[PDB]
Amino acid sequence: APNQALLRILKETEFKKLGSTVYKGLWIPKVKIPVAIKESPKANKEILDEAYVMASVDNPHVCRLLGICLTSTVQLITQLMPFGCLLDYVREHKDNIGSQYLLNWCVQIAKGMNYLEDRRLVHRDLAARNVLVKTPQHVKITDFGLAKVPIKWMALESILHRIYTHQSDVWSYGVTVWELMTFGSKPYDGIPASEISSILEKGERLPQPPICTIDVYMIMVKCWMIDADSRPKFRELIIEFSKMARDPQRYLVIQGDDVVDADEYL
Ligand SMILES: *CCC(=O)Nc1cc(Nc2nccc(-c3cn(C4CC4)c4ccccc34)n2)c(OC)cc1N(C)CCN(C)C
Numbered sequence: 478a479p480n481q482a483l484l485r486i487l488k489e490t491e492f493k494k495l496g497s498t499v500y501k502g503l504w505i506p507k508v509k510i511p512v513a514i515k516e517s518p519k520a521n522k523e524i525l526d527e528a529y530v531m532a533s534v535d536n537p538h539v540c541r542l543l544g545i546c547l548t549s550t551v552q553l554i555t556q557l558m559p560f561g562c563l564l565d566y567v568r569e570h571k572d573n574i575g576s577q578y579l580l581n582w583c584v585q586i587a588k589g590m591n592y593l594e595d596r597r598l599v600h601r602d603l604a605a606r607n608v609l610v611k612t613p614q615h616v617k618i619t620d621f622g623l624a625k626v627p628i629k630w631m632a633l634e635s636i637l638h639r640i641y642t643h644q645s646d647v648w649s650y651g652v653t654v655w656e657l658m659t660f661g662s663k664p665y666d667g668i669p670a671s672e673i674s675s676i677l678e679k680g681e682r683l684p685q686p687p688i689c690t691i692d693v694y695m696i697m698v699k700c701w702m703i704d705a706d707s708r709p710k711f712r713e714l715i716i717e718f719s720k721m722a723r724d725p726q727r728y729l730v731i732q733g734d735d736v737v738d739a740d741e742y743l
Contacts, residue, residue, distance in 0.1 A: 480533055482532045482533040483532065484528070484529075484532050484544075484545065485532075485543065485544035485545070486544060486545060486547060487504070487506075487543070487544040487546050487554055488546070489546050489548050489552075491504055491505055491506055492504055492505075492512070492514055492546070492552075492554065493505070494514055498515070498516050499513055499514070499515045500513065500514045500515075500516075501513065501557060502514050502557075503736075504543060504554060508735055508737055508742060509735050509736045509737070510543065510556075510736075510737065510738075510739055510742055511556075511557035511559070511736065511738065511739070512543060512554050512555065512556065512557050512739070513554070513555050513556070513557045513558070514552050514553070514554050515552060515553040515554075515555070516550045516551075516552050520551075521551050523622065524551050524553060525545075525551065526622075527553065527621050527622050527624075528542060528545050528553055530598070530621040530624045531553075531555065531621055533596070534592070534593065534596060534598070534621075536588075536589060536592040536593075537588075537615075537617075537740075538585045538586065538588045538589030538592065538616065538617050538618060539589050539592060539593065539617055539618050540555055540558070540609060540617045540618065540619040541555065541556050541739055541740070542554075542555055543555060543556065543739060555619075556611075556617075556738070556739035556740070557739075558609035558610055558611050558617065558619075559610075559611070560609075560610035560611070560612065560613065561609065561610055562605070562606050562607070562609055562610070562619075563582065563605050563606075563608040563610055563616055563657065564604070564605035564606040564608075564656060564661055565606075565661075566610050567605070567656070567657055567660050567661045568660065568661035571660040572733075574660070574731075575725070575731065575734050576688075576725035576726055576728070576729035576730075576731055576734050577722065577725045578613060578614075579657055579658065579725075579729055580718050580721050580722040580725050580728065580729065581614070581722055582616055582657060583654055583657070583714070583718040584715060584718045584719050584722060585615070585616050585617075586603075586608060586616065586618065586650065586653065586654075587650065587711050587714040587715045587718060588711075588715055589617065589618040590618065590643075590646060590647075590650060590711045591710075591711035591712050591714075591715060593618070593624075593643075593646075594643045594646075594711055598624055598625070599624065599625050599641050599642065599643060599645070599646060600618070600621070600623070600624050600646050600649070601623040601624060601625060601626075601635075601641050601645075601646070602620060602622065602623045602624070602626075602627060602630070602649070603618070603630065603646055603649035603650055603652075603653055604627065604630050604652070604653055604656070605653050605656035605657060605661070606620075607619055607620035608653070611738075611740075625641070628670040628673050628674075629652070629663075629664045629665050629670065629673060630648075630649045630652045630653075630664070631645070631648070631649065632644075632645040632648035632649070632705065633648075633674070633677045633678065633703060634705060635648075636673065636674045636677070637674065642705060643711070644705035644706065644708050645705065646711075647700050647705075647708045647709065647710070647711065647714075648700055648701060648705075648708065650700055650711070650714065651696075651697045651698075651699075651700025651701050651708075652664050652683070654693075654696070654697055654700075655683050655686065655697055658686035658688060658689050658693065658729070659686045664683055665683070677701075682697075682698060682701050683697070683701075688729050688730055688731050689728075689729065690727070690728045690729065690730065692721065692728050693721070693728050693729065696709070696714070696717055696718075
């Protein structure tokens with residue numbers, strides 16, 4: 478099927494500039510769009526591969542590409558996510574994240590990944606750092622630099638044979654949920670990356686997070702099966718976490734539980 482996605486090229490005089498470079502700015506084509514601008518031939522060839530992917534996806538739980546600017550430096554312009562990556566957010570707000578937010582985030586990430594699977598697209602880098610927060614009630618998947626290596630998030634098949642599937646993304650989804658349920662802990666913290674391949678082969682997995690019932694930890698374990706086709710599908714993960722979002726305290730035990738956004742500029 479032909480990929481009739483549009484690549485928008487923006488004037489540099491429309492922007493008015495966060496991490497290193499990514500910047501916070503406004504895009505004024507009477508409308509002001511809060512945006513994030515990201516400034517050798519290797520660098521330009523890879524950032525255009527990323528713009529190709531983001532321009533070809535359109536889903537409420539996937540980061541939208543607004544355009545590229547062709548100046549001395551190739552600049553990517555995306556929707557500004559004011560609350561950051563989900564990894565920093567869960568670390569800075571542990572004392573205030575409820576089970577409702579955690580389970581709903583798991584639903585939204587699975588929806589975004591299920592859409593990426595419909596697009597016949599493998600992310601290859603699903604992680605808590607690569608999930609941005611529009612509002613605490615709305616997250617989106619980002620960073621498609623490897624979307625067609627971080628060993629601690631990869632399936633065993635990706636480590637050994639460099640094989641990547643939608644089901645290897647499911648493994649990365651399992652680690653991402655584990656980062657959230659541990660409020661931002663580091664997977665296999667301390668263990669050198671060269672030893673991860675031996676550990677997984679022996680049968681060991683990431684531990685059960687303290688706030689997780691066996692229901693939630695069972696889903697993570699299923700994402701980490703050696704047999705990729707035995708791991709759950711993203712459409713099933715949506716269904717499972719959505720049921721748990723209807724009674725969150727039953728599955729997560731936690732103590733004390735003219736500016737227009739890009740989503741409206743279509
Ligand atoms: C964990 C890091 C982070 O996300 N920080 C952050 C982000 C935003 N908004 C935002 N919107 C859209 C895109 C980006 C963004 C994209 N990339 C690259 C890899 C694809 C980066 C890289 C580094 C930073 C940001 C991006 N970001 C914020 O909106 C405001 C605020 C934050 N912070 C919490 C800043 C403090 N961090 C320690 C950097």
